Structures are given as C-alpha cells and as structure tokens.
Design an enzyme around this catalytic site. Structure first.
Site, mmCIF file in Angstrom:
data_model
loop_
_atom_site.group_PDB
_atom_site.id
_atom_site.type_symbol
_atom_site.label_atom_id
_atom_site.label_comp_id
_atom_site.label_asym_id
_atom_site.label_seq_id
_atom_site.Cartn_x
_atom_site.Cartn_y
_atom_site.Cartn_z
ATOM 1 N N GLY A 16 2.116 -0.361 -42.850
ATOM 2 C CA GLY A 16 2.233 0.675 -43.856
ATOM 3 C C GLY A 16 2.665 2.000 -43.263
ATOM 4 C CB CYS A 130 -7.868 14.154 -41.630
ATOM 5 S SG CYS A 130 -8.713 14.266 -43.261
ATOM 6 C CG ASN A 163 -12.003 7.260 -51.168
ATOM 7 O OD1 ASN A 163 -12.406 6.349 -51.885
ATOM 8 N ND2 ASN A 163 -11.012 7.104 -50.295
ATOM 9 C CG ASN A 267 -4.245 14.698 -44.885
ATOM 10 O OD1 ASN A 267 -3.109 15.162 -45.073
ATOM 11 N ND2 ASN A 267 -4.728 13.679 -45.589
#
Length: 292
Positions: A16, A130, A163, A267
């Site tokens: 990806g 991040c 998340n 990030n």
C-alpha cells in the site's frame, strides 16, 4: 559490480501507500539494499510499481517470502496490526529482524534519537505513533536537562491523512516511558481546512523542582531538532521555546518529504522516515557485529 561497501538487504511486507513510500526512501539509502516487496495480490498497484523499479515482487504473502528468506535480513511490516501478529511470529522464527510500522506494538517501542541505542538487538521494533515520533524527541530533549513531571502533546493533522482514543493512550504512555515524563497526555486533532495543513505538534512540559537552566534546555531542544531533521528534513521548530516558570512550550511543524505520500501527510511520512533511520542504525550494528 566490483568491490563495494557492505549493505544489509531489506524487504517491505505490504504493498500500500506506506510500503510504496518506504520503497522510495530506501532507494536513497547507502547502507540498506531493498530487494523485494511482498504482497498478497499479483495485481497490486504497489507490486507493479516495485516490479517496474527492478525489485523482486512476491504475491504469496509472508509464506512466499519465507520460501526465499535470503532476500532480506530486515523486514518492514507495512500491512496492518491484525496481520502483524502472525508476521512477527514467523519472521522471528526465521531469524529475521522486523520493523513494525503498524500499531500492533508486539516489539520494543523506539524513537531513534532517544532510546534506539538500548534496543539494537531486538528482534522486533515498533515505531509507536506519528505524534510519538514527532514529540517524544522534544520531551526527552527537555527531560535530559531537567526532569519532566508532566508533558502534554497536541498533534494536529490534516483530515485527509476508537482510533483517536487508542493512539492518544499509546502516545501518552510513550511520552512517559520513552520521553521520560512522569505523566503524559496526548491530544490528536483532525483539521479539515483546505488546502490541507502540514502536521503541527505542540509540546507542553512542566519541569520538576530545582533552578531552571534555560539556555541548557533551549540548546538541548535546538540540538534535538537538528538531529531529527537529519532523517526528517521537513521537521522544524516554529518559534523559539517559550518559558513561563517551570512550563516549557515547543511548537513544531512536520512537512513530509513528498516521496509518495503527499507533503501534507507528515504524520505518515515521519513514520516511514523514522523506520528507515531505525533500520539503518540496526544495519550498522549488525554489520559491525558479524563473524563475531
């Protein structure tokens, strides 16, 4: 061919955006040699890209790589946290070192300019988050001059990059364990503004008792910023460090390299940049150790 400086072979598990961004960065390494990208779909767009660039592509997943284990000594896992659990088990059994770019966090959490030096022999290292890669260097830059009792970081990223709750907790615990703050808090904010904004971070730190040596703290922070810039060129401090009593505030912005990820995805870019940096330091350690 001819004679050459030794390199460590590496392979990217995952096809990806993250895996493709890693591949772009690995091409510029003079100590890592990328040999292969490993996916599960022979029609993958990232595998195509890698094939075009001359790398070996494997579309039969982790088992396909383990059939050709000589392709790599260090593997970057750019798939997902759920897939990483099996990858980690099998890669460790095959004697490979793995960099986990997922939240699975099976191995040791590392920030390269802070605690990598204690983890050069780990089988599996994880890059936290991040916000962690961006701000833990700063918390540590402060804590190594003057102990930090509380640090709060606020990461603001572009929307186009449970998340929130899980990442703030891992960041906050990373701020404590790796940054050195006794108590840590993390806030992630998503900003829909158009055009997309560069990632920004704010670090608040409250230092403990004792006289504050302001110059020493500021020089430590500026030195850290230069050190991170060496593997994240768009990492910058926005104004000087602000002091008010025992409170120090540092304002950061993290522009991505734009290798494959957009520049406003700093990030995500900091994760692949920090992964490459970690892999290079592992590689130099491994090269120095060998036949011994």
């Amino acid at each position: 061919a001819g004679s050459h400086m030794s390199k460590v072979k590496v392979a990217i598990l995952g096809s990806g955006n993250i895996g493709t961004d890693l591949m772009m960065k690995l091409e510029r390494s003079n100590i890592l040699q990328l040999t292969a990208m490993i996916g599960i779909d022979p029609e993958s767009d990232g595998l195509r890209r890698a094939k075009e660039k001359g790398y070996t592509v494997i579309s039969t997943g982790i088992k396909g790589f383990l059939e050709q284990p000589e392709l790599a000594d260090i593997v970057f896992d750019a798939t997902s946290a759920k897939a990483h659990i099996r990858h980690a088990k099998l890669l460790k059994e095959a004697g490979k070192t793995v960099l986990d770019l997922t939240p699975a966090a099976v191995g040791a959490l590392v920030v390269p300019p802070v605690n990598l030096h204690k983890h050069l022999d780990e089988w599996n290292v994880n890059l936290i988050t991040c916000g962690g890669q961006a701000t833990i260097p700063i918390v540590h830059a402060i804590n190594r001059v003057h102990p930090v009792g509380y640090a709060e970081i606020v990461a603001t990223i572009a929307s186009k990059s449970a998340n929130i709750d899980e990442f703030t907790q891992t960041t906050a615990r990373g701020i404590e364990k790796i940054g050195g703050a006794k108590k840590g808090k993390a806030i992630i904010i998503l900003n829909p503004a158009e055009p997309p904004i560069m990632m920004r971070n704010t670090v608040y730190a409250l230092v403990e008792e004792g006289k504050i040596d302001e110059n020493a703290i500021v020089q430590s922070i500026l030195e850290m910023v230069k050190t991170v810039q060496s593997y994240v060129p768009g990492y910058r401090i926005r104004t000087e460090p602000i002091m008010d009593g025992n409170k120090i505030t540092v304002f950061l912005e993290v522009e991505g390299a734009g290798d494959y990820l957009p520049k406003y995805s700093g990030n995500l870019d900091i994760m692949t940049a920090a992964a490459v940096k970690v892999a290079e330091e592992l590689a130099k350690h491994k090269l120095a150790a060998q036949t011994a």
